Amino acid sequence: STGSATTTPIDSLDDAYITPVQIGTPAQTLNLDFDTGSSDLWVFSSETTASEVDGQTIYTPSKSTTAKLLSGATWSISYGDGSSSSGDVYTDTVSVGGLTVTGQAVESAKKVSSSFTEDSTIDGLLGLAFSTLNTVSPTQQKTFFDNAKASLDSPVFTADLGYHAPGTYNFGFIDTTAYTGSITYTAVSTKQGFWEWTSTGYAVGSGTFKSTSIDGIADTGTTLLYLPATVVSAYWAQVSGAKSSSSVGGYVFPCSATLPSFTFGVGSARIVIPGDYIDFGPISTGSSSCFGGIQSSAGIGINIFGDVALKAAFVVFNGATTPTLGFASK
């Protein structure tokens, strides 16, 4: 089997992407944030504290003939940005782009933090990291991909995120029309539960490539590119007036700037992030200070190849017995 679903930016900045997901019988379609940096499929629901729902579409398990309470199971998750959610668990039928999993754990939120409430466009998350990170207790649950894998034509999914445009998540096949040149594959460590890999270096604009190992994670659920302070300083030094602002929470730059590109290495291959992808717009409405899309990972504890990086590539998440990651230009 295979599946193919379009993923759409939630706003004009590509802050996140939503993908429609069918849950239950008859189908309830919710727009979920596919997150290769976590491993829980959770939804706003009929159980979510009413004051914490503001415009989201909810899953109502009592209206699904295939929903079953997973008795005694609870979940609770905290994300890198400080947001969180928690609740109980149902199993139900879940379909993405025509690919169906029966008995998928659907984590029903009883509580969500303010960042989730405030984002009316995101009805929940669909985790695509390794199932070892799943938070369900006392019986850990599998991701949608893990459950689907055996049925897939090939044990893979791909992320093809758009810049200010829709893109695609495919399951079970590689669309050879969706990228240019060849795919370069690179080793993955699953030791921390992430799609963790080592970039071979970087360049700023038309500058020379610096060969240096940068361990980080491929994370579709993180908006920006978070890299070591040395790398980030070298980038922003090429933008007149750019500076790190403790009050704003990162590097800012004059909105009048033309940003240089940023290149990262994948083995001997190179992925180029155009300068425009690194512009996250005014820090506050009408400001002439703009927020940068490359930020320091110092104090996160891990480097994160988030959407800014991934959307410059066609990315293969290879879940074969020894997982790997593939990157191609597009």
Determine the Cα–Cα distance for residues 201 and 222; give it in Å rounded to an integer: 21
The pairing of beta strand 156-160 with beta strand 184-187: unpaired
Tally Cβ neighbours within 10 Å of residue 179: 20
Instruction: Tell me whether domains 5-174 and 175-330 share a fold.
Output: yes
Header resolution in angstroms: 1.2
Please say if 35 is a catalytic residue: yes
Amino acid, res. 303: N
Of 45, 86, 131, 199, which is the active-site residue? 199
The pairing of beta strand 68-78 with beta strand 84-96: antiparallel
Of 35, 40, 92, 279, which is the active-site residue? 35
Determine the Cα–Cα distance for residues 250 and 243; give it in Å rounded to an integer: 8
- Tell me if 108 sits within 8 A of 89, measured CB to CB: yes
Determine the Cα–Cα distance for residues 108 and 105; give it in Å rounded to an integer: 9
Q: What is the DSSP letter of 121?
A: T
Experimental method: X-ray
The pairing of beta strand 184-187 with beta strand 99-112: unpaired
Each domain of the chain, given as residue ranges in start order, spans 5-174, 175-330
Give first-to-last CA distance, the chain, whole Å: 25
Enumerate residues 6+ apart whose C-beta is below 8 A from 73: 88, 89, 105, 136, 137, 138, 139, 141
DSSP 226-291: EE-HHHHHHHHTTSTT-EEETTTTEEEEETT--PPPEEEEETTEEEEE-GGGGEEEESSTT-SEEE
Among residues 289, 260, 293, the alpha carbon closest in space to that of 275 is found at 260
Among residues 157, 111, 154, 193, the alpha carbon closest in space to that of 314 is found at 157
Candidates 3.40.50.2300, 3.10.20.740, 3.40.190.10, 2.40.70.10; CATH matching 5-174: 2.40.70.10
Q: What is the DSSP letter of 45?
A: B
Among residues 322, 39, 37, the alpha carbon closest in space to that of 188 is found at 322
**CATH no. for 175-330:** 2.40.70.10
Please say if 15 is a catalytic residue: no
